[PDB]
Design a protein around this ligand. Sequence first.
Ligand SMILES: NC1=NC(=O)C2=N[C@H]3C(S)=C(S)[C@@H](COP(=O)(O)OP(=O)(O)OC[C@H]4O[C@@H](n5cnc6c(=O)[nH]c(N)nc65)[C@H](O)[C@@H]4O)O[C@H]3NC2=N1
Ligand SMILES: NC1=NC(=O)C2=N[C@H]3C(S)=C(S)[C@@H](COP(=O)(O)OP(=O)(O)OC[C@H]4O[C@@H](n5cnc6c(=O)[nH]c(N)nc65)[C@H](O)[C@@H]4O)O[C@H]3NC2=N1
Length: 766
Amino acid sequence: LANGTVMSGSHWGVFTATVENGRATAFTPWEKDPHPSPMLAGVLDSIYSPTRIKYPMVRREFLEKGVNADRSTRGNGDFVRVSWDQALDLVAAEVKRVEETYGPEGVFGGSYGWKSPGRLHNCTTLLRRMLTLAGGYVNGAGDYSTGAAQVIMPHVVGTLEVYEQQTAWPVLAENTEVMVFWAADPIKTSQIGWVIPEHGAYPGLEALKAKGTKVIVIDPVRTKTVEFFGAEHITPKPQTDVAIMLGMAHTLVAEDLYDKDFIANYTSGFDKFLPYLDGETDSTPKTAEWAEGISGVPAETIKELARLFESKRTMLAAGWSMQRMHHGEQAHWMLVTLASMLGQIGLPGGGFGLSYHYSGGGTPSTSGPALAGITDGGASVIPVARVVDMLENPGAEFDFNGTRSKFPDVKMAYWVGGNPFVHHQDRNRMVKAWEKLETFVVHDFQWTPTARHADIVLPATTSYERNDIETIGDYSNTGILAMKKIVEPLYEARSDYDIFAAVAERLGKGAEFTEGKDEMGWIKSFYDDAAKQGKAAGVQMPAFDAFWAEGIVEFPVTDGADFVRYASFREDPLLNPLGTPTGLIEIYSKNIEKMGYDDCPAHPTWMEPLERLDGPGAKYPLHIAASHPFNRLHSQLNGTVLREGYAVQGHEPCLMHPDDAAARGIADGDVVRVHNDRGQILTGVKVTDAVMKGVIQIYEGGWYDPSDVTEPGTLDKYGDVNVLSADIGTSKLAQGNCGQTVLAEVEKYTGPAVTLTGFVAPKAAE
Ligand SMILES: NC1=NC(=O)C2=N[C@H]3C(S)=C(S)[C@@H](COP(=O)(O)OP(=O)(O)OC[C@H]4O[C@@H](n5cnc6c(=O)[nH]c(N)nc65)[C@H](O)[C@@H]4O)O[C@H]3NC2=N1
Ligand SMILES: NC1=NC(=O)C2=N[C@H]3C(S)=C(S)[C@@H](COP(=O)(O)OP(=O)(O)OC[C@H]4O[C@@H](n5cnc6c(=O)[nH]c(N)nc65)[C@H](O)[C@@H]4O)O[C@H]3NC2=N1
């Protein structure tokens, strides 16, 4: 039994593991990590927690009756343990059956999810690689993060923008006078990376602070970002940012402050937006006063913020919560319009950036090569959050970015690396729609709500039980890490690659799936390709064994630290045009105009959302800020020792303002029921003035624990906030999710005592 230390990586960062007698006993942060995440101790625990999945299992009803099984009991925990050969045979037959009876349109393989980093052990790509050899599948398009903004940005600035490099942090420290964080909490969200994180935002934030730059935070909650800087804190009613923006815009026009030359030379359509802004088209001048009526931010503050932004070198750094909402396309389009008026786009330290809060955006990029991994070998496509509408309406038409298509008639869904029974909106509607699927197959290493609702569950390994390779730094490209195997696979878990190879072998496509390569065979070909490309560029890299032995290769920064977004566009717009039809920033879009969608007009517009705090005729009184957890990565690590540090009487915490608690007779630590017309959950309250009055904070990612899966509307005992959200599209343009457009009521829970069952394994899988 192994004794020693191994260096690996994860979504939380690079770390070294201490191994004693074959068991991992500690995870220590990399010595070069400038700001490790306290969640690493849950990462270690997730390998061994009580919800680790030990063996392959098949739902008793599915085993007994297949397609005639009662599908309303999915999630009741009545599983049967089976051997691997039996489950592999059954998965293979099911894939074959659905592909022959129904075609590629009967298999949903979008399998949305955060999985784990790794260029070889890429479970979602491997799933698509297997399914492509089986005949095809329906896929997902977009994501739950920027569903609206990633569609609107290309119409407005000609590129995706949300996942592109930002003006380097050092440039901001030298040049920015006012830094605005709009619906962004960089301190909280920069702990993680899509590939391994370098945590580059922390030194970037430290440098602004050290320089005395003025920092403003626009957020309903007083976050760690406000506290870190002692920032001026503006607290709007959630979903009213566009109103605020329009009032600022109005003020710049009324007081004649805006940059008319920038407007004239770098933008298109302002002259079509001005009438709206001034109130000629609807009789409603969008003044600061008007904006105060909707958002509750004082008129005078709105004009003061406007005047300050125009006279100082200002960076508008915006988060994505505000577009994860009804009409969410308007938030970033109005933000770019406002930035246009200020006219600082393309100057060092000015303009706007849409990725300073995620994966190190702004961290100076190196000049190293890109690393690539296994590939998938490749309506057939749906916007990802329309999964439930698809299941309910096979054959119906839907709009998406100017086109019309029809929903495929899906009969099977195969999910790996994701938790839709946590991440998707309107849990009760979803639980009923899932009955439309004949077979539901899932691989995970933790017994999440999704695993609990499968017909067939296959235990996967973590990254700590195998070898892989991955880049460090989604934007920085700081280096390449060897993700070395720390302990052996636990119980009967197997890597996703191994399971898929065995299924492909049973479909008679084994060789095509593996390409005749084993684990190290694949990893070395990704490395050799990256070294070959590096040599071409003049970056020297060791040979593979030398690399593997050191465990990491770092790259040099040459001019990456001088990067300024949009500089060449500002420098000469004709020579360096945007990808838009006019080549300019499009305030009014003729392209959007021609689609003629009522919920997405051709210029940024204030529109009432489905439900909003203090909106006319609103039924519920509190906005739920259903934002990202501080101490989880979505649902990951919920079933670990970290839960004990935030849970209130065992439930997911609910933050509530002293006055809202006082009005309902609630005291700190009480168990309360949060409910609206879509569902009802239990949470434990923390009374704090960190949330503005009218707002409550329930993070997304809580593990759904239904009291009874056969009872429609059954009470969730843990606190999955997606039990209360609605499942609707941002608009016909993007069809994004509206996960944070949520109102509810809260009362002291006075029903029967409840026993939590989500943090232990189903009895048969013990
Ligand atoms: N109401 C609401 N508000 C929101 O802000 C919100 N945010 C959304 C966002 S932006 C997104 S990205 C989604 C994220 O939702 P997503 O389903 O991506 O969530 P995770 O909790 O990261 O689930 C990933 C699963 O993969 C499993 N897993 C990890 N590694 C492996 C592996 O190698 N193999 C296998 N088989 N499994 C693995 C993990 O154990 C975990 O259960 O939530 C969305 N949902 C949201 N809802
Ligand atoms: N620790 C951590 N856990 C995670 O799960 C996690 N998820 C990652 C993922 S996949 C992504 S996509 C990003 C998400 O990055 P994103 O910016 O979408 O994060 P949120 O936590 O949903 O919201 C950020 C802030 O917006 C505020 N806010 C909410 N509604 C409004 C509003 O109407 N107006 C204004 N002005 N502010 C509002 C919230 O209070 C919150 O502080 O984070 C990434 N980083 C993450 N870090």
